[PDB]
Design a protein around this nucleic acid. Structure first.
Lengths: 555, 411
DNA sequence: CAGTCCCTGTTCGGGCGCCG
DNA sequence: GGTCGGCGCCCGAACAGGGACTG
C-alpha cells in the first residue's frame, strides 16, 4: 500500500476497551451489488485492503442512494466503534452566513470529490475499521476489508478532514494573503479583488496545489458564473437569497409535518421578514406521538396563510460593507414575539430574524427587549465581529427609568429611539415613599397544607376590613390574593403593607404579563391606579394591623 | 536545556473541555499576531482534533494600556489541578502585605515563558482561535512553556523567583513581596516618592534576568461599610416599620438585636404617613441596638481551608456594596464602591470594575480569589463582561436574583 | 430543630430545519 | 434510509435551590 501525501492523524481508543465485534445485517441483493462494485473499485485505488482471519474485528455496513444520481454511497454503522473511540474536539465552531461576505470582484466555488476517501487513516488504527461484505449467496463466506482512508459514519472523520484540509490550504493562503477562502468541509468559496484574468490563474494554482496531496477538483462541480450555489444559498454579484423553500400543503397535518413546517419557517426567517411560528408551535406542546394527526387552530391557520403570502414575494439580502456602520432595528410583533432587521443602508437588509423565547413565569416588554438585544449582539459578533447600532421602539426616558431603578445589573449598547408603534413602556410605577392621605391596607393571607383551604383579606386605618375564604389554594396564592383585594377595594392612591416576600418580589419587577391569571389581575389593577406604595414588614412581630389581620386569616 | 517539573491532574478527573465563545474583530486580530509571534518563538505549537481538551481564550487591555494582552480562561484547568499548587508547591501569604502604606502590582507573566512545560501535561493547555463568520475552522494551539494564567506556573517558577528576589530582599528586608498568578505585589511603608523609585530598582533587577507595568494600591486606606441606622428626630409609622424590618434582618448577624419595644409602637392599624412618638422603652432599645452595631461580630475569623464568597448589591446612583464571607452572616469584610468607571450609564462596566477591585483586595488580605454572587442575569453578564475586563486573572462566579429586602447595607 | 412542598429557574434529552 | 460532525428552533422532564411552615 502506497503512502498518502497528506500527514495522518494519530487516533487512539479509550483506555481499556477493544475494537468492535458486530455481525453483519441481512442486506438486499440490490445493495449487495452496489457494495461489491464499490468495494472492488476502492480496493484497486488503495482505499481498502483485504484482511485475513488475524483480524478479529467486524462492524455492519450498508448503503443508501445518492440524491439525483445513480451512484451509491457506502456507509458503515460505526455506532460501537464510536463509543470506544477517543473523544475529538470539533473544529467546526459554526456555520458561515452570506450576510458576512464582502463584495469581491471575482468569485469561484469548487468541490472536492469524495472528500473523506482522499485523506488517509492512521496506520495503527486501520485494524479496527474491519467490515464484511455479504455475497449474493448466504453460504459464501464473503470478502473482508479494512479502511485505509476516512470512513463515512465514523465520529472522527469530519473533525480529521477539516483540520487536515486546513493544513493543506495554509501554505496557499500564506503566499496569497488577499485571497479569501471560505473553508467548510469540501466546499471552497474562493474570492478575490484581483482582475478576472489573474483570478483564473490563482484558481488553477489552487487546483494544482490541492492536486499534489490527492485532492481532486472536478470541473463538474466547478462554478465560474453566477449565481453560485454555496451553503444552500444563491450568490449573485449584488444580492443573495436562500435556495427555494417548499412548504408542505397537507390537508391533514401530523406532528412530524408541523416540525418540518416549523423547521423551514425558522430557516426562512433569516431573510423573509415577519415570519411567526407562535400559534404553530402551540400545536406541539403536550403532544406525544410524532404520527398523531392534529387539526389546525384558527390562530394557526391564520398564521400559516400569512407566512405563505410572505414567501410569495421575492426577498434578497445584500453583502457586508466594512466602511459603513451596522444597524439593527427591532419591532414588537406579537405577545412574546420580536422581529429584527440588520442593515447598513435603509431597506437593504443584510439578514432578518426573530426572538420569541419566554423566560420566566413573570416578565415585561423591557426585559424581553433586552434579551432580544443580547441575542442580536452575539449573533452579530459571530457574523461580522462587531455590535450593531440599535434602533429600539422604547423611549430614552423609559429605559433610563427602568435600568436605574432595577436591582439587577442591566445595560443596552449604543442605541437610539425609533418611533415605530407599538412602543415599549412601563405600565405602572411603584412609589418610593408612602402616599399621604391614602388609605393604608394591611393585607395578609394563609392556608392549610392538608385541607387546601385558606383566607385572604385586609384591615385599613379607616376601619375598612374584608376576609375571603379560599378553596384549593396555597400560602403563596393567598398572599397574592390579599394584595389583589386591597387593589380592588381602594381608590386611585393606596398604601399596601404586606409580610410576603414572594408577592413583593413579583410586583417590584414591574411585570406586564404572567403565566398566572391572579398576577395578570393584579397587573390590570396596578395599571388603573395612580399611586401605589408597597411595603414589607416581618411577620409574627405584632406589626400594625398585620398582626390583627394575621389572626383573622389564620385558619 | 531545562528539566521539566512533572505535573498531574487530580485523581479521577479528566482535562477541561470548554467551548470557545465568539470574539470581536479587534480581539481576533490581536490573538493572531500574538500567537503567530509565540509560535515563531516556540512558546506554542499548532495541534489537531486528536486533542479532546480546549480552554477559552480572549484578549484584554489593562488600565491605561495600548497593547493587547492574551488571556486564557484557565478556571477549569486550575480546578482540575488544585492539589499541585497547594499541597506540594504552595506559596506563603504574608499577613503584613495588607498593612503597607503603598502596594504596587507588577505583571511578570512574560517570565513564565522561559521554563518549559511537562510533555505529558501539554495536552490540557489546548485552546482554539475562532474566525469571523466561521470563514475558517478553529486554529488550535497548545502551550510548550509555562502558560500565563495557570496556577501551576507561579508554583514551578517559585524556586526560580526566590533566587532572583534574594539580592533585592536582602538590601530591602522591610519590603514585602507576594506573588499571585502572573502578578507580583510589592508593598512598603516608604513615602510615595521613594516607593516608586524602589519599584524601578526591582524592574531593572528583573530585566537583567530575562523579563514592566504598575498599578498602585493603598490598603491602609481601605474602609469598611457598617450597618447604620437613621438618625431621625420625627419618626412615622413607615419609618419604624422599615427600621424594625432592618433590625430583624440585622439580628441574623448580631444576635443581641431586639425589636420588642419598637414593634409595640406598631400595635394599631395606623396610616403609614402618621407620625409616632417614640416611647421611653423604645428609645433605649434603639440606642442599645446602635451600640451593638458598633461592636464586632462574635467569633468571626478567617479559615484558610474554606473558600471565600463575595456578594454585591446594586444600590443605584453609582453605588455598590459588597461583603466577603466564608460562613453566612460571618462577614470578614464589608465595603462600598462609588463613582467607578461607567457610573450613571453602564451597570455592566461598574459591576466588572467592582469584581476586579474586590478580587484584588481578597488577594492582598487573604491571598485567595472569592466566588462571586453577581446581581445580574447570566445572559447579560456573559455578553458584555469580556469588553470591560482589565485583569490577568478571572474569579469564579454564580448569578443570583434577590429582590431588595430592606436595603440593609446602604441607607 | 430537619423534614416536606410551594415556587421558580436551569439543564438536558430529542424532534425538526440547514450545511458538508 | 434509520452513518457522522456542526449550528439553529421548540418542547417537556429531570434536576436544584431557596423560603415558609411543621414534628
Amino acid at each position: 500500500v502506497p503512502i498518502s501525501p497528506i500527514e495522518t492523524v494519530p487516533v487512539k481508543l479509550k483506555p481499556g476497551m477493544d475494537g468492535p465485534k458486530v455481525k453483519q445485517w441481512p442486506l438486499t441483493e440490490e445493495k449487495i451489488k452496489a457494495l461489491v462494485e464499490i468495494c472492488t473499485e476502492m480496493e484497486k485505488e488503495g482505499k481498502i485492503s483485504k484482511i485475513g482471519p488475524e483480524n478479529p474485528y467486524n462492524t455492519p455496513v450498508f448503503a443508501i442512494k445518492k440524491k439525483d444520481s445513480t451512484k451509491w454511497r457506502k456507509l458503515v454503522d460505526f455506532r460501537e466503534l464510536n463509543k470506544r473511540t477517543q473523544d475529538f474536539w470539533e473544529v467546526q465552531l459554526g456555520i458561515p452566513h452570506p450576510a458576512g461576505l464582502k463584495k469581491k470582484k471575482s468569485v469561484t466555488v469548487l468541490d472536492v470529490g469524495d472528500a473523506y476517501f482522499s485523506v488517509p487513516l492512521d496506520e495503527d488504527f486501520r485494524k479496527y475499521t474491519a467490515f464484511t461484505i455479504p455475497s449474493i449467496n448466504n453460504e459464501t463466506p464473503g470478502i473482508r476489508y479494512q479502511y485505509n482512508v476516512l470512513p463515512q459514519g465514523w465520529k472522527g472523520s469530519p473533525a480529521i478532514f477539516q483540520s487536515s484540509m486546513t493544513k493543506i490550504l495554509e501554505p496557499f493562503k500564506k503566499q496569497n494573503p488577499d485571497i479569501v477562502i471560505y473553508q467548510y468541509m469540501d466546499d471552497l468559496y474562493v474570492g478575490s479583488d484581483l482582475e478576472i484574468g489573474q483570478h483564473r490563474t490563482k484558481i488553477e494554482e489552487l487546483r494544482q496545489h490541492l492536486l499534489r496531496w490527492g485532492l481532486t477538483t472536478p470541473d463538474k462541480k466547478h462554478q465560474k458564473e453566477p449565481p453560485f450555489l454555496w451553503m444552500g444559498y444563491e450568490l449573485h454579484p449584488d444580492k443573495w437569497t436562500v435556495q427555494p423553500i417548499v412548504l408542505p400543503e397537507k390537508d391533514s397535518w401530523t406532528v412530524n409535518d408541523i416540525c418540518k413546517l416549523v423547521g423551514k419557517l425558522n430557516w426562512a426567517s433569516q431573510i423573509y421578514p415577519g415570519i411567526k411560528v407562535r400559534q404553530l408551535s402551540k400545536l406541539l406542546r403536550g403532544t406525544k406521538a410524532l404520527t398523531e394527526v392534529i387539526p389546525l387552530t384558527e390562530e394557526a391557520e391564520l398564521e400559516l396563510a400569512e407566512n405563505r403570502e410572505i414567501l410569495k414575494e421575492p426577498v434578497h439580502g445584500v453583502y457586508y460593507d466594512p466602511s459603513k456602520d451596522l444597524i439593527a432595528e427591532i419591532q414588537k410583533q406579537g405577545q412574546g414575539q420580536w422581529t429584527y432587521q440588520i442593515y447598513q443602508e435603509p431597506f437593504k437588509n443584510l439578514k432578518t430574524g426573530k426572538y420569541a423565547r419566554m423566560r420566566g413565569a413573570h416578565t415585561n416588554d423591557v426585559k424581553q427587549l433586552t434579551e432580544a438585544v443580547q441575542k442580536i449582539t452575539t449573533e452579530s459578533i459571530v457574523i461580522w465581529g462587531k455590535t450593531p447600532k440599535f434602533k429600539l421602539p422604547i423611549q430614552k426616558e423609559t429605559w433610563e427609568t427602568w435600568w436605574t431603578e432595577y436591582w439587577q445589573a442591566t445595560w443596552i449598547p449604543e442605541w437610539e429611539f425609533v418611533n415605530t408603534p407599538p412602543l415599549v413602556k412601563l405600565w405602572y410605577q411603584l412609589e418610593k415613599e408612602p402616599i399621604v392621605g391614602a388609605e393604608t391596607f394591611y393585607v395578609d393571607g394563609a392556608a392549610n397544607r392538608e385541607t387546601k383551604l385558606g383566607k385572604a383579606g385586609y384591615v385599613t386605618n379607616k376601619g375598612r376590613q374584608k376576609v375571603v375564604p379560599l378553596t384549593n389554594t396555597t400560602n403563596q396564592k393567598t398572599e397574592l390574593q390579599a394584595i389583589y383585594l386591597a387593589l380592588q377595594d381602594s381608590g386611585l392612591e393606596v398604601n399596601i403593607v404586606t409580610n410576603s416576600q414572594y408577592a413583593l418580589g413579583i410586583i417590584q419587577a414591574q411585570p406586564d404579563k404572567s403565566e398566572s391569571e391572579l398576577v395578570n389581575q393584579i397587573i390590570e389593577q396596578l395599571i388603573k391606579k395612580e399611586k401605589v406604595y408597597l411595603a414589607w414588614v416581618p411577620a409574627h412581630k405584632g406589626i400594625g394591623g398585620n398582626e390583627q389581620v394575621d389572626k383573622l386569616v389564620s385558619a | 536545556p531545562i528539566e521539566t517539573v512533572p505535573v498531574k491532574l487530580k485523581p479521577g478527573m479528566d482535562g477541561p473541555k470548554v467551548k470557545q465563545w465568539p470574539l470581536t474583530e479587534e480581539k481576533i486580530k490581536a490573538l493572531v499576531e500574538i500567537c503567530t509571534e509565540m509560535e515563531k518563538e516556540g512558546k506554542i505549537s499548532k495541534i489537531g482534533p486528536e486533542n479532546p481538551y480546549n480552554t477559552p481564550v480572549f484578549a484584554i487591555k489593562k488600565k491605561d494600556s495600548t497593547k493587547w494582552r492574551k488571556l486564557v480562561d484557565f478556571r477549569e484547568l486550575n480546578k482540575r489541578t488544585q492539589d499541585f499548587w497547594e499541597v506540594q508547591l504552595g506559596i506563603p501569604h504574608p499577613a503584613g502585605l495588607k498593612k503597607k502604606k503603598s502596594v504596587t502590582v507588577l505583571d511578570v507573566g512574560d517570565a513564565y515563558f522561559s521554563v518549559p512545560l511537562d510533555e505529558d501535561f501539554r495536552k490540557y493547555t489546548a485552546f482554539t482561535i475562532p474566525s469571523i463568520n466561521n470563514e475558517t475552522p478553529g486554529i488550535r494551539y497548545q502551550y510548550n512553556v509555562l502558560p500565563q494564567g495557570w496556577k501551576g506556573s507561579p508554583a514551578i517558577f517559585q524556586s526560580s523567583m526566590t533566587k532572583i528576589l534574594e539580592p533585592f530582599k536582602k538590601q530591602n528586608p522591610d519590603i514585602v513581596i507576594y506573588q499571585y498568578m502572573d502578578d507580583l505585589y510589592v508593598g512598603s511603608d516608604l513615602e510615595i516618592g521613594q516607593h516608586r523609585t524602589k519599584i524601578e530598582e526591582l524592574r531593572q533587577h528583573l530585566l537583567r534576568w530575562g523579563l514592566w507595568m504598575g498599578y498602585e494600591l493603598h490598603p491602609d486606606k481601605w474602609t469598611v461599610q457598617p450597618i447604620v441606622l437613621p438618625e431621625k428626630d420625627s419618626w412615622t409609622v413607615n419609618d419604624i416599620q422599615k427600621l424594625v424590618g432592618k433590625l430583624n434582618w440585622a439580628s441574623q448577624i448580631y444576635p443581641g438585636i431586639k425589636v420588642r419595644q419598637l414593634s409595640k409602637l406598631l400595635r394599631g392599624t395606623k396610616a403609614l404617613t402618621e407620625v409616632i412618638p417614640l416611647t421611653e422603652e423604645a428609645e433605649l432599645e434603639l440606642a442599645e441596638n446602635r451600640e451593638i452595631l458598633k461592636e464586632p461580630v462574635h467569633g468571626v475569623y478567617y479559615d484558610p481551608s474554606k473558600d471565600l464568597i463575595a456578594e454585591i448589591q446594586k444600590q443605584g446612583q453609582g453605588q455598590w456594596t459588597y461583603q466577603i464571607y466564608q460562613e453566612p452572616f460571618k462577614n470578614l469584610k464589608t465595603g462600598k464602591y462609588a463613582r467607578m468607571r461607567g457610573a450613571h450609564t453602564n451597570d455592566v462596566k461598574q459591576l466588572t470594575e467592582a469584581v476586579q477591585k474586590i478580587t484584588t483586595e481578597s488577594i492582598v488580605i487573604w491571598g485567595k480569589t472569592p466566588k462571586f454572587k453577581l446581581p445580574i442575569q447570566k445572559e447579560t453578564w456573559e455578553t458584555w463582561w469580556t469588553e470591560y475586563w482589565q485583569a490577568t486573572w478571572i474569579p469564579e462566579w454564580e448569578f443570583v436574583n434577590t429582590p431588595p429586602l430592606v436595603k440593609l447595607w446602604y441607607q
